[PDB]
A paper describes a structure:
The small heat-shock protein (sHsp)4 chaperones play important roles in the cell by preventing aggregation of destabilized proteins (1–3). There are three structurally and functionally distinct regions in an sHsp subunit: (i) the conserved α-crystallin domain (ACD) that defines the family of sHsps and is shared by all members; (ii) the C-terminal region (CTR), with a conserved (I/V)X(I/V) motif; and (iii) the N-terminal region (NTR), which differs considerably in length and composition between the different sHsps. In this study, we describe Hsp21, a chloroplast-localized sHsp, which has a long NTR (82 amino acids) with conserved methionine residues that are important for substrate binding and scavenging of reactive oxygen species.
Here we describe a structural model of Hsp21 based on a combination of homology modeling, cryo-EM, cross-linking mass spectrometry, NMR spectroscopy, site-specific mutagenesis, and small-angle X-ray scattering (SAXS). Because the result of this refinement exhibited a relatively clear D3 symmetry, we continued refinement of the reconstruction in D3 symmetry to a resolution of about 10 Å. The CTR tail-to-groove interactions occur only within the same disc, and the interaction between the discs is instead modeled as a direct CTR tail-to-tail interaction through an extended IXVXI motif. To summarize, we have obtained a structural model of Hsp21 that fits both SAXS data and cryo-EM data, suggesting a division of labor in the chaperone activity of Hsp21 such that the CTR tails maintain the oligomeric structure necessary for the chaperone activity, and the NTR arms take part in the interactions with the substrate proteins.
Numbering used by the authors:
A (entry chain G), D (entry chain J), E (entry chain I), G (entry chain C), J (entry chain D), K (entry chain A): 42 to 184
B (entry chain H), C (entry chain K), F (entry chain L), H (entry chain E), I (entry chain B), L (entry chain F): 83 to 184
Write the structure that this text describes.
C-alpha cells in the first residue's frame, strides 16, 4: 500500500532514505519491485484542501470500465484492472498492457458513497472527499 | 514511446505512439525526405488533472519508409492517448508463420 | 540531515536538524495531519562569510508521530545551526538496556 | 558510414535505441568503436534547405590540405587524413593527431563538381548542393 | 595540506586531473580519504585582494573554543578539534562529531600576530592578512 | 585540454591549449601569484559554421611555475585553434635520454 | 519437472549447456531458482535395470508421513511436504524446514499400484517398477 | 551444518548437527580443553540407498563453552540424521522478549 | 564438443563430435531408451605425438531423438578426429529459407 | 590476537564462518587485514600433548636476534621484529621485509621462565610448556 | 611469436607473471588475444635431445595439405592455413574452422632442408633437427 | 618467489629465491641453452618443526641471460632460506641515477 507517511520513501523526514535503509540494500537483490506491473498505470496523487478528491489519475489508454475496478478495502483505495486480450485481427493500438493492482493508504477512512470515479480520454480520475478540519495551526518562532 | 509492427497489408511503420494528454491539433504526421515524421508538443490541462510519468515538451520521430511504400495511402488515427500510423505496403505479403494450430 | 532518537521521557522525533545559517524566523515547526513538519528556507549572509557544503534552498521534513503523542507539549530549540525537536511520550518508558556496568 | 536515417541511433524514431539494441549490448563487449580515431576530427552536419552545403565542419588544427582528402565514393562523402609526423625539432603544437577516415551517407547522390571544400583556421568546410524540391508537404489533423 | 596550486586537483591547469592521475586510480583502492574526519568540518577558503583574511569558515556547531585550535606550523594553517564527548544526560544535539585536523598551505608565510580567529554561531572564521602587491599585471594579446 | 611538455630550453608549461574558435582578443595569458594563467571566453561565429565537440563558455587554467622560471621571457602564440605557451628555464638542461640510435 | 533427457542440463549431449544457453544467461537475472525450497530435500535418482525402483531418496529428517506426500500426476512423480511448525516448547532439533515440491519425469508411465514409498531414518525411498526390455542393443564399429 | 541456539535453561551450544547417514557409534561428543567437540566419520550404506548433497568424510566441530557451564550435565541425542547437544547454564536465565502478545 | 545440425533429409542429431586421437574401436554409437548415445575412451599414442588441448578420459553423450525418428537407419562415420552421426527423419522436410538469391 | 577458539575462523564449530559473518561482509570493504605485514613472517602453531612447546615456527630469513623479540604480555605470546634496513652496498639478499607484530592467545597462562625461543636457519622456534592434565575424557555413545 | 624464453609467460622464471605484468593488466582490456583464431589449431611443442624434431603437432581435422602451409621466415617457424569453405551440399563434418597463423621462435636457426612436415589423421607434425651440443653441464653444490 | 635486480657489476639475474627448508644438495643452479636454471625439490624435516606458507614439491626457474653475459663467472650462494645468483656483466655499467643527494 503506498503510504506517503511511511518512513521508507525519501522526503525530508526522520527516516531519511539515504540512511541505513538505502545504504543497507542499495542493490535490489531479492524480491521483485512489481515496477513492471505498475508501469501499466502510472498514477499520481494530489491532496487538495477540500478533498483528497483524489487527484489520482491513472493512465489507462484504451481501457474499458469493465476491465478496471475501483474498490475500497480496509478503507484503503484499490486500483486494478488489465486491458483486454488481443482479438484475431485486433488493432493492438499498443504495447503490452496487463495485470496490475495498486493500493494507496488514505490518511482517513473514506465515505465509500462520497468517492466518484470517472474514466475519460484513457484517464481514470478518482475523487475522495475528506472531512473539514482547521488543520493544526502552525506556530511560528522568532530568532 | 513507439512500437514497430508488421501486418500483411501494411507496416512500414505500423506504429504507435504513447501521446497521452495530446490533442490531434498538437500532433503532426508527415513524410519528409520520404521518411515518416511524427511531431508535436505537449500542452497543459486542468489543475484537477494528474499525471505520473514523464514531463511535457516537444517531441519528434523519424522513420525510414521502404522506397516502395504507399506514401499517399498513409493514415493516422489518434484515440485515448495513442497515435496509430499505418503505411500500406506496395504488395500485401504476410510473414508466413507455420505454428501448430488447428 | 536529521537523526531520530529515543529518550525515556520522549521521542517521537527526538530529532535534530543540521540547519546552519538559518534564522529561527526562517524555520517553522508544526504538526499537520498529526505529522511533525519542519520547514524553512535558507537565505544569504555576509560576503565575509564562507560555507563549504550543500547550497541554499527551501527544505521541508515530515515525521509520523505516534497517534498517542503529546502534540501540545512539542518543543523546539535552535542553537548553533541545529534544531532540536522534542515530542513527549504519553508515558515515559525508557528502553531497558542490561549492559554490564557498575 | 554515418547515416542519420539509420535505425541504430536514438532520435525519436521507430527503432528507439533504448529497445532491444541498447538493452541487448549495453556493454561495448566486442569490436572497438573507432571513437579514438574519430576524436581526431569531430565533425557535425547541418542540412540547410538550399543545400546539404554540408554544414560539415571538421576541426583539423594545424593540418595541411595535402594531409586531408575529401572524396566521394558510391556517391557517399569521405573525410580522411592525418597530421604530419613530428620533425626533429618540431614544435608539436599538439596532442597526438593521427589516421582517421569518416564517411557520411548523403540522402541523395551528389554532383561531384558542385561540392566545394575549403580549409581555413584549422577548419574544413565541405558544401554539398542538393536539388530543389517542394518537400513533401505535411498535412495537419484536427482534434 | 590542501594546496590550491597542487597539480592533483582539477581546475583548468596543466596537470588536468582527467589525465594519467584520474584514469590510473579511478577506484580509491588503497589508503582512506580522511573524508569521514573532514566531514566533521567542511571549510571553504576565499582570497580577497586585501587578505587571505581567510575567508575560511568552518562549520563547528556546538563547539567550544577549548575544543578547537587554530595553529600555524611551517607557516601553514592548521584547524583541529573535536566536540566534547557525551555527558550522562547530554542533550546530544547532534550526529557524531569527532577528531579532525585540516591544513591549508598559504601562498605566503603569514604573520602569526596578524591572523584573527573568531568563533560565533557555530562558525569559525580565520583571517590571514597578506602583503600588498601590484599583482603581476596581465598583458593582453590581439587577434 | 592542455598538455605539459618539456624542452631543454624550456618548459615550465611548454603548454598547449585546444582553443578552437577563439580569437587572440578573447584569450589572456598571464602569470598571477607567480602561477601561469590562461583564460578567455568562447564567442559565436557564422551560422554557416559547424562544431562537434564541447560547447562554449569561459575557461581559465592555472599552472605552477618553478620559482626560478623566467616569468619575463614567457611567450604565447596562437595558430589554428591552439595556444602554445613557452616558459624559459633559468638553465637549459635537456633530460638526457640514452636510446640506441646511430 | 526434472527431466534427465532435457537439453538444459549438462551431460555429454547435443545441447551442451556451455553453448548458447549457458553463455546467454550466465547470470541468473530474472526468475528465482526455487533452490531454497529444494534445499529442504535433496534427492537423487538412480535407475537400476529391474526398476526405476527409484533410487530416489530424499533427506527429510524429523518428518512425519502425514507431512510428506508421494503422488503421481500426468504419470510424473511428485514429492512434496513440509516439516510441522514449531510447538510452544518444541525442541527445534533443526534449521528451518518448509514448503517444497519436486517433480521428476519418468521415462515411462508408471503403474501407480507398483510404486512403493517408505520413510525410515529421516529418509524417504520411492520404488518405481519398470517394464522389461532387451534395451536397444548397442552395435560396435571397428577402426 | 550446525545452528547455535539459546534456551532459558541452556545453551552454550544448544546445538544441532545435520549428521544424516551417521550411526551414534560413528559420533563422538566431548568437551576437550573445556571446549565442546563433535566429531565422527561418515561410512557407507546399502547400494539400494541414495543421497544428494555433500559426500562422506570425517568431520569435527569445536565450540567455546562459557567457563561457568555445566560440562558434567551436557547431554547429546541423535534422531533422524540430527544430533542435538544441550549444555546446561549455571543459572537458567531466559532472554526476556517484550513482544505484544496476549 | 558436439554440434546439432538440421538437414532436410535428416537431423535428429545431425551431430558431430570432436573425437581427435580416437580409434573407431574405442567409440560406441547407440540408441538406449530411444536416446542417442555416443561414448568411448581416449587411449595413449606414440610419444613422438603431441596434443594441446584437453586431456584423456572416458566421454559419453546423450541425445533426445524424436519419437518418430528412424532409429534403424542411424549411421555413424568417423574421419580425421570427428564423428558424424546422421538420424533420418520420418519425412524429409527442409526448413524453408526465403533469402534473396538468384 | 589469533585465538583458535574464536568464533570468527572456520573450523567445524558453532559460529560456522559461512553463516552471517562471512555472508554479511564477503567483501573486505573497510579496515585493512595487516595481511601485508604478517606476510613478512608466516607462522604456524602446533600443540603437542606435553606442550604448546609451541610448535610456532616463524620464517625470518636473514634476521638477527636483535631485530626479533619474543614477549609475553597479558600472558599472551607476542612475536615482532623487522629485518634491518639496507646498508649502502647491502646485498639485499631479499624482497622487502619490514615491521610486523603477531600475537597468539595461549589457552593457559604460560610460565615465562619455561618458554624457550631459538633462532636458527632463518627460523624462529618458540616452546611453551603447559601443565599436565588428564584431558577431559571423551565418553562414547552407541547406535 | 611464441617464445618459451620470453619473460611474459609463467614458468618458474625471473619475470614471474604474477608480478607487475599480471597484477597491472589482470583484465584483458584492450587488444584481442587472437585466442579465437588459435583455437582453430591447438599445437604443443616438445623438445627432444636429438631434435626440436618439433614435437609440434597441430590438430587440423579434415584439412588438406593445400590449405595448410609450413614456412620458415626470419628462421622462425610459421604454421598457417584454413579449412576450405562450405560446398553447396557439404557435409560440414564440423564447427567453424577458419583463418589462423601461429609462429614459434626456435632457439636456433633451422636448416630448412632438414625440417620435415607430415599431415596424417588430421594431425600435422613438423620435425626440426638441431645441432649436437654437450649442453652446458650443470655443476652441483653441497649443503 | 624470485626478484630480478641490477647492480653495476652484475645482473643478468641478480636473483634471489625464497628457498626456505632447502639444503644446497637439493638445489641446482645451471645455465642450459644459455638460460639460467634454478631447480630443486623440497624434502621433509623434524616433526618438531613448523611451516606456514606453501607446501613442498619440486620447483624449477628459467631466466634469459644476455647473450654477452659471463656464464663462466656465475656464482650462487645459499644462506638462511635464500638463494642468491649473480651473473657478471661483460662491462660494469651502473644505471646512472641523478637524485638530489649531498
Amino acid at each position: 500500500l503506498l503510504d506517503p507517511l511511511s518512513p521508507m520513501r525519501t522526503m525530508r523526514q526522520m527516516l531519511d532514505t539515504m540512511d541505513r535503509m538505502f545504504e543497507d540494500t542499495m542493490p535490489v537483490s531479492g524480491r521483485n519491485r512489481g515496477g513492471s506491473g505498475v508501469s501499466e498505470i502510472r498514477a499520481p496523487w494530489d491532496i487538495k484542501e477540500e478533498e483528497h478528491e483524489i487527484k489520482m489519475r491513472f493512465d489507462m489508454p484504451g481501457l474499458s470500465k469493465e476491465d478496471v475496478k475501483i474498490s475500497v478495502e480496509d478503507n484503503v483505495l484499490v486500483i486494478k484492472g488489465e486491458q483486454k486480450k488481443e482479438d484475431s485481427d485486433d488493432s493492438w493500438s499498443g504495447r503490452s498492457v496487463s495485470s496490475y493492482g495498486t493500493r494507496l493508504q488514505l490518511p482517513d477512512n473514506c465515505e465509500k458513497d462520497k468517492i466518484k470515479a470517472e474514466l475519460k480520454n484513457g484517464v481514470l480520475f478518482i475523487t475522495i472527499p475528506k472531512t473539514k478540519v482547521e488543520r493544526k495551526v502552525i506556530d511560528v518562532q522568532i530568532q | 514511446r513507439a512500437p514497430w509492427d508488421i501486418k500483411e497489408e501494411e507496416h512500414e511503420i505500423k506504429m504507435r505512439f504513447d501521446m497521452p494528454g495530446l490533442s490531434k491539433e498538437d500532433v503532426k504526421i508527415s513524410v519528409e525526405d520520404n521518411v515518416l515524421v511524427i511531431k508535436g508538443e505537449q500542452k497543459k490541462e486542468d489543475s484537477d488533472d494528474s499525471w505520473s510519468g514523464r514531463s511535457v515538451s516537444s517531441y519528434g520521430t523519424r522513420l525510414q519508409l521502404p522506397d516502395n511504400c504507399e506514401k499517399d495511402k498513409i493514415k493516422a488515427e489518434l484515440k485515448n492517448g495513442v497515435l496509430f500510423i499505418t503505411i500500406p505496403k506496395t504488395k500485401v505479403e504476410r510473414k508466413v508463420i507455420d505454428v501448430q494450430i488447428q
